[PDB]
Design a protein around this nucleic acid. Structure first.
Lengths: 49, 148, 49, 58
DNA sequence: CAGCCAGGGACACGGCGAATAGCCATC
RNA sequence: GCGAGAGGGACACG
DNA sequence: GATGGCTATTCGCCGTGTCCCTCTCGCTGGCTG
């Protein structure tokens, strides 16, 4: 998803005037991590008694 | 269909004038083609050329004749489609090819009603006799047989 | 094909807070992730990291 | 441009050049000037032949 | 950037019922 | 004071 | 050659037990100062 976003915003941004820090949008990756660890069918609540 | 009945000859006669006019256009194109082929003839026979060269200019002119008369045939087919639709413009039927329908309505805006969408289904329901079709189905069940 | 972007050097920092502290304070026990980029240009030629 | 001389690379601005690298691409060793701006936090590497074309200047 | 707005495909089976597909018959 | 997901208990061997 | 008209094949639609306990999470994007 992040690669989709970065390649799409590459066109709009003018060349020789932008940086990878300005290209990479990290919201989708952290969102994917969060939605895996939370509310997923394998990140099960720990069964410790 | 009322208008349909009568126009069944007047509209066809005007349409037949269309057929004649477009066929005359076709044969005029073919005559121009034959004239340009005679051009090819004399030109190549004189213009420094090879035997097969003038053979092939003749062949190309023949091919041009062929494509002209073919286009004429295709537009004649299109005419036939218009007349087949209007003659067989039975109600409660589906007409594909939006371009076709536009042709009909601009040429035959009257003589029928056409629509598309839910409101078309509404109109079909309004102009639809329950008793007539019920009696028809009673006849079919009483007399028919099989899948029907 | 006028440019390209690449990644490398996946590095993990030390965890922000220890295990019991994270369990108590509703904090997710995570560590920051740092990845080095390389934004190569072709029309003019330069790589950005 | 020489090592240790502060240079202006637009649009970012001031930066400090670390060294000249001769890494090979297509079998040719290129004068890879490598330059760093603290604010941008970006390693700008360019051949010295086309340095003026990109616009880097003192 | 946030209040307040709003706008891209995976292991199931079994049975029932309708719409075709393919093939022999006749005008 | 709803939905999804996960785990779990109870359910004839003549 | 097309409508009838019979058998076969796809292809959708419908269904597939009851009761209870616990836990955790709940969609994404733009204007603008």
């Amino acid at each position: 998803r992040m690669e989709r976003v970065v390649r799409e915003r590459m066109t709009t941004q003018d060349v020789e005037a932008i940086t990878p820090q300005t290209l990479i949008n990290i919201r989708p990756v952290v969102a994917a991590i969060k939605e895996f660890f939370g509310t997923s069918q394998l990140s099960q609540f720990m069964d410790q008694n | 269909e009322e208008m349909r009945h009568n126009e069944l000859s007047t509209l066809e006669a005007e349409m037949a004038v269309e057929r004649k006019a477009v066929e005359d256009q076709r044969d005029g194109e073919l005559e121009a083609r034959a004239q340009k082929l005679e051009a090819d003839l004399a030109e190549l026979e004189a213009e420094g050329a090879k035997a097969d060269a003038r053979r092939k200019v003749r062949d190309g002119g023949e091919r041009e004749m062929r494509q002209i008369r073919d286009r004429a045939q295709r537009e004649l087919d299109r005419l036939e489609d218009i007349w087949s639709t209007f003659t067989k413009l039975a109600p409660k039927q589906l007409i594909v090819d939006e371009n076709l329908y536009r042709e009909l309505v601009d040429r035959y805006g009257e003589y029928f009603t056409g629509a598309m969408g839910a409101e078309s289904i509404q109109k079909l329901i309004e102009n639809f006799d329950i008793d007539a079709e019920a009696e028809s189905l009673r006849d079919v069940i009483r007399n028919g047989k099989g899948q029907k | 094909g006028s440019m390209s972007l690449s990644f490398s050097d996946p590095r993990f920092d030390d965890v922000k807070a220890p295990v019991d502290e994270c369990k108590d304070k509703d904090m997710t026990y995570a560590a920051p992730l740092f990845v080095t980029a390389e934004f190569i240009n072709n029309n003019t030629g330069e790589i950005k990291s | 441009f020489k090592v240790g001389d502060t240079v202006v690379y637009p649009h970012h601005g001031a930066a400090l050049v670390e060294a000249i690298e001769t890494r090979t691409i297509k079998g040719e060793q290129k004068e890879y000037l490598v330059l760093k701006v603290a604010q941008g936090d970006l390693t700008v590497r360019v051949p010295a032949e086309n340095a003026e074309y990109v616009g880097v200047r003192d």
